Design an enzyme around this catalytic site. Structure first.
Site, PDB file in Angstrom:
ATOM      1  CE1 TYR A  54      -6.409  11.204 -27.348  1.00 18.71           C
ATOM      2  CE2 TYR A  54      -6.448  13.084 -25.846  1.00 18.71           C
ATOM      3  CZ  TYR A  54      -6.512  11.724 -26.066  1.00 18.71           C
ATOM      4  OH  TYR A  54      -6.729  10.886 -25.002  1.00 18.71           O
ATOM      5  CD  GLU A  56      -8.752   9.283 -30.455  1.00 16.47           C
ATOM      6  OE1 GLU A  56      -9.114   8.420 -29.642  1.00 16.47           O
ATOM      7  OE2 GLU A  56      -9.412  10.330 -30.734  1.00 16.47           O
ATOM      8  CG  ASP A 209       9.463  -9.718 -28.729  1.00 15.20           C
ATOM      9  OD1 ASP A 209      10.090  -8.633 -28.755  1.00 15.20           O
ATOM     10  OD2 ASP A 209       8.756 -10.012 -27.752  1.00 15.20           O
ATOM     11  CB  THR A 235      11.607  -2.372 -26.646  1.00 13.72           C
ATOM     12  OG1 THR A 235      12.694  -3.279 -26.853  1.00 13.72           O
ATOM     13  CG2 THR A 235      10.627  -3.029 -25.727  1.00 13.72           C
ATOM     14  CE  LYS A 238      13.657  -4.841 -23.036  1.00  9.20           C
ATOM     15  NZ  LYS A 238      12.576  -5.704 -23.461  1.00  9.20           N
ATOM     16  NE  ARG A 244      11.677   1.640 -20.118  1.00  8.51           N
ATOM     17  CZ  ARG A 244      12.462   1.563 -19.095  1.00  8.51           C
ATOM     18  NH1 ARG A 244      12.375   2.462 -18.138  1.00  8.51           N
ATOM     19  NH2 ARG A 244      13.287   0.563 -19.015  1.00  8.51           N
TER      20      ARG A 244
END
Lengths: 447, 454, 447, 454
Positions: A54, A56, A209, A235, A238, A244
């Site tokens: 973790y 954060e 985008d 992304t 692609k 991903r």
């Protein structure tokens, strides 16, 4: 129980499913323009011990300790991200935490706009993305259209291009705070310079985008939206061929007076929208970005363009129409109306012979076909000519089942049923598969 | 170039980073209550060819073709999810696509509320989560508090428990449409039945965010919020011990009149908020869910409780105070004020001897005031096969660190001073290096879920 | 102290002010198109004991008792309102409580839309009203644009007419829930039938704001928006010649399925927006509505049209240009650019000779002039020709001060200062006044 | 047609209606606390030629010309407004355009808050006003609660006073940006100083809505909210005894750093919300404000207090209960439950004998429950020169009516039954006709502000 046991041993049911999927991918012809095949190297990072941290916050500014290494990873993912798009660190910053493409766009909107502020994107059936704004007559569909106020701009139905003239007229009136340049189903280059003029005039942010085309941009085989945009989202899959995940790039340092994107963008990602970063994805992304700086990747990307051209030409040469008459990128849009067919029909036929494409709006009248995936399997121009041959066999099977039936539901029955149709399909499938299986495949061998 | 080459061969820089991280995890004592160590089986699914399929939509209702197998995976992830929490499919449905815990909460809110509708959650410094709503005096911090209107409910600082009485009074006035029961830093069981009464009265939805405790619930070692909630969200990591991902469960079929959660929840996930599902995560989650149905997992979960008790008792026995006096779950909240120290100091010392915990705000404190407490959790080490004596031993090391921190505080003024003294003063460096080396030697001996090398 | 003492006795300071104002009105030429002179009968109701009744609610459904009479008044104001516009009670309802024109519009929006829902009105400088939506580049100005989301439609700058074609194109995209047809500064008839087609197509409400023209409509000297609109709002002053107040009309009974305007509209007026009705205004309005049913009023309204024509023609015949080339209603829009002047200048000159008009946007390039007020003082066509003569004297004085100075601030100095300019003005004023004082004046003699 | 003809000549139907209304007012006993009788002087200004001027904008900054005189009127209305409340022009500004009390409140909210910002006002059935925020379980009722987010604060039903303690607790949580101090049905003085402390703490604006009490404040017979508030709104009717209209007062000049109320408040009134000012009302208001500076007005206001006391005492003396036990202002709240009746019944009976009062909700009651109380006010009758004995006499008549209502209740079941019995049963009709006729004979004898005939 150690948690060190193999998936094949501990969950055979699941392992069988992974193997069925791998075989499906290995035997099929993947023509969905959004898809690619991710490197084994990147997948090794994705399935790593990085899932167990973790972190954060941001490097040097974490909620919790024990992050020395993860900090180094994230900073390295940033540097590699800037290098891959040839960006000066004094002029550009990047955020590498967004969980995917859609989250990255929401974070931009929430960082820069107030609720109910105005946005324009390419209308969805004109080839835009849901996240750019979308509502039917009766309801708000995209979250973008719920929390913000969106109005679409449109294609010129004559040229198949984006009506830049209408955009300027329409944006002078609607007064959007953010305009979005980027597409899901468009076969040509976008006039970033023009969109920027429009944005400068009405005092709006230009967001690009580039999800579909980020690979092509990194490889410098097409013009970069970074010359003209304030903010760029993408992304990592692609055409970038990564795991991903998502990225947000933003201008920084001096505007004229400083840019104020950095702090707002990072704050919206965290704490406003997301929880713990997915460090294993961040690491896979970094591996993919390093790969995209290479000459090898530039060859791959050039080949992507050539194979899309080749597929275009092969379709013209069999008398199909192409929206905008061709392509300047990685995909082609086939108008099946002047060939007496429609996307819905075609898609389902192709699917049954292990060829995967999309119906696309013009029961809609088109089909979208893309090159990046098969190119990644070392397909060259002749291989794509051969692909078109198989496609055309399938269209011609389709056309034949249409004149022999009425409605779409009828059409789909006739295929799984009539033996003379069934065999013609089983024969074709088997040839497609035999042809496909022969090409190599990025990834692991077995899953 | 095949894309079949190994990471150690193609990206040695990155591979070296993975190995440093693995050695850090292997050598350290992980006491962050949110963490766990994910099974190798699950990680194999996560790094699979499932990363390469776009499957926007839902099983049988996909935008694109070629999804026969992915459909089977997602449906299987659903079934295993319902089975793991002992739920009737006629009464409960589940969505397995959310990318993480935070997205799952946003999807619920967007599915069920209008922008600017009202929400209540446990105040953040009282042990709630950001996604439950949070704003400072001067600004909106959570996206939950930007798109929606949030008002916190609070702990009774006398008991350290949730003031259910004050919740009812305050919700009668604020009139929320959604009330959230779930915590990030709370050592006790939540009165789901009570929250439900409050929700029934004011006509609000009850959402349970069981992220921290989902493992315990699945194992049935604590009461289930599914008896009382309309909607349940969770992460798939933390105590479920999966890959990072999220779930939304929802009632379906007949309410009294049908439930209408199903269509709205699924629609908000997709198309409203998300793009393509992460099928590799979905598959890893499914692996983790299968593992959670086993007896082994129940033993693990029982052991989690016992080890937190043991850690609690070992701290009491050395004169520390615990908020609420103990725990009924997987974590303990330690009040360091009566001992002459604070979370900020303690955390940094522990970090430097390879023990990772959090500073944490103590009830009745205006944060800004540097936090008086520490949060410690059992799930991670328990997964490395720690038992009660091992946790007693962990507390010994913690206490050594506290005592070191205490000495550096008597020799320092401010927090900034305190941190530099730990790096600078050589007598302090050595005392730390000695302790670190003992902690590491002790930790490296225990097994570790995952792969060996990365 | 009885509260029965006269204003002249108890507040001489105020009484003197009322008398100065009455003299100003009596001696001046009032060409503001929004203004009129209210009947003594209506003013007697306005200053009545009706101010002393709180009647929150609606007839038969009041919060408090003692409302038998006020109920009868309000119901009578309704009936007279429907009669004046030739409406069937089974098809139309009316609310008579709105305190003015602006409140009536807000109540419609709040009754029918959600916050942030979309509205289109005629852009403000194109001759729309603030309440129809208005924001600058930098800020929200109308409350309509704060609580709701507004986008303007525009004039065709070639014809001076409303670009109905652009409206349809632009509304297909923006998707408004409410479109507003009505104007503050437009010299022609509105194509209610066309707006309705557009509204039917995009599934929006058509609201007509007939504030300016309600007198003309009631008199049936121009087509009625009631043939085409769902909802009609208006002031009770302007061409209706009443006291300051507002009305909302709405369709009711069967649509196809009932109309649902009635309950929402009344609920938004009260309890949502307003407090106690102003019964004295309601009563004055009713008096004005009875007056508007008469043949006398139809003569007045016909004369309004004739006098605006006459003023138009007299201006053409002295070589001024008129936006849209003329008028089909009660006002004319004069383009002072092709006469080498601008509204700002002209207005100030005219003001100084007791003629009141507005600058109007094309330092802006036009002037708006209206007939209803002077017509109410029994002015006929020759009287308006004579008015134009005085106006032209003033324009020509203006033109002369412009070539003799630089900026607007300069221009205004030169007028109060240079004696040769001062006298030419004092002379003209005195002739204007002598001419004006000779005509009769609705109202009381002294205040 | 000149438009110079009289109303009796041109519209006899309407003239007859005015005359019926005037006779109703002349013959009745007006106890609605919101009402008053406006001076003839003010009504002459109201029905003046000032109705015929469009003056959008502000003095010296008008859209159109020809406003020399109207400018002088508006500036004069401002000065008289500041003088009437004893305010320094360097410290306070005023806007005189709002069309009524409700528009004045909306303008303040739109000037100072963003849509969906938070507001607290006294709950409606606890004696607040609609414009302070109000929603039922199922819907938003006030436009204040549609455009903004409102949460009520409440009475302590034990004391009948405003629970200041609960306000502070609840505002610390809800975090409002504006808190409203002002009432429609409250018999006591408000702790402006306390509300201010609460506002200072949570960083909210304090708005005082003195609509009911502005006369009393101007007369200085009760403490002024201008000592403590940032913004003050009021009607110009009620106890100020003017024409129907509204005012907004606001601090200006130096705060500590300047105040920024002036430009925002004026901008929200116009251009944001309103059109053309109603100059005839503005002028009537100014007349009323001049009258309120006089000694005569101070005597009137003192007498208002004494008469409400007297009415209170006369009710106590006959064994009625009063919420909060009495009054410190112009109204009294009568609890009819202990006497075996309710506001709904009492109101309707009183109405039928030409006495007009309101039913009113009693503290601790869920409305729906038919209201247990009655509100009674002094300002109107005091304006007709009523003194203490006259109000004692008024209470006698009220009590006769209560006792009649009591008999019809023992002979009836439901409210609908009760109302028809009053029309139908002839023995009841007569007892009422007798009482009505005595009330009227008594009332007609007192003078009446205004014109004689209309």
């Amino acid at each position: 129980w150690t948690g060190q046991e193999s998936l094949s041993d501990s969950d055979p049911e699941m392992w069988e499913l992974l193997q069925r999927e791998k075989d499906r991918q290995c035997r099929g012809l993947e023509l969905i323009a959004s898809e690619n095949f991710c490197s084994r190297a990147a997948l090794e990072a994705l399935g790593s011990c990085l899932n167990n941290k973790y972190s954060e916050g941001y490097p040097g500014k974490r909620y919790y300790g024990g992050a020395e290494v993860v900090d180094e990873i994230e900073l390295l993912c940033q540097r590699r991200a800037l290098e891959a798009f040839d960006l000066d660190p004094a002029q550009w910053g990047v955020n590498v935490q967004p969980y995917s493409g859609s989250p990255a766009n929401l974070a931009v909107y929430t960082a820069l706009l107030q609720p109910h502020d105005r946005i324009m994107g390419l209308d969805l059936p004109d080839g835009g993305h849901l996240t750019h704004g979308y509502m039917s007559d009766v309801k708000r569909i995209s979250a973008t259209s719920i929390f913000f106020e969106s109005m679409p701009y449109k294609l010129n139905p004559k040229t198949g291009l984006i009506d830049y003239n209408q955009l300027a007229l329409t944006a002078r009136l609607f007064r959007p705070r953010l305009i979005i340049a980027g597409t899901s189903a468009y076969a040509r280059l976008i006039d970033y310079a023009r969109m920027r003029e429009v944005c400068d005039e009405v005092k709006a942010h230009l967001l690009a985008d580039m999800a579909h085309i980020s690979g092509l941009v990194a490889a410098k085989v097409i013009p970069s939206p970074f010359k003209h945009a304030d903010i760029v989202t993408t992304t990592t899959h692609k055409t970038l061929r990564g795991a991903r995940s998502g990225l947000i790039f933003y201008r920084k340092g001096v505007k004229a007076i400083p840019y104020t994107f950095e702090d707002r963008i990072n704050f919206a990602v965290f704490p406003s929208l997301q929880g713990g970063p997915h460090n294993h994805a961040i690491a896979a992304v970094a591996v993919a970005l390093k790969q995209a700086c290479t000459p090898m990747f530039r060859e791959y990307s050039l080949q992507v363009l050539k194979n899309a051209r080749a597929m275009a030409d092969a379709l013209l040469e069999r008398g199909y129409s192409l929206v905008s008459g061709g392509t300047d990128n990685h995909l082609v849009l086939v108008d099946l109306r002047p060939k007496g067919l429609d996307g819905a029909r075609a898609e389902r036929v192709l699917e049954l012979v292990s060829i995967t494409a999309n119906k696309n709006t013009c029961t809609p009248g088109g089909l979208r076909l893309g090159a990046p995936a098969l190119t990644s399997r070392q397909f060259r121009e002749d291989d794509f000519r051969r692909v078109v041959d198989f496609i055309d066999e399938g269209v011609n099977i389709g056309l034949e089942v249409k004149s022999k039936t009425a409605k779409l539901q009828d059409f789909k029955s006739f295929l799984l049923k009539d033996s003379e149709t069934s065999q013609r399909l089983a024969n074709l499938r088997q040839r497609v598969e035999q042809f496909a299986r022969a090409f190599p495949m990025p990834g692991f061998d077995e899953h």
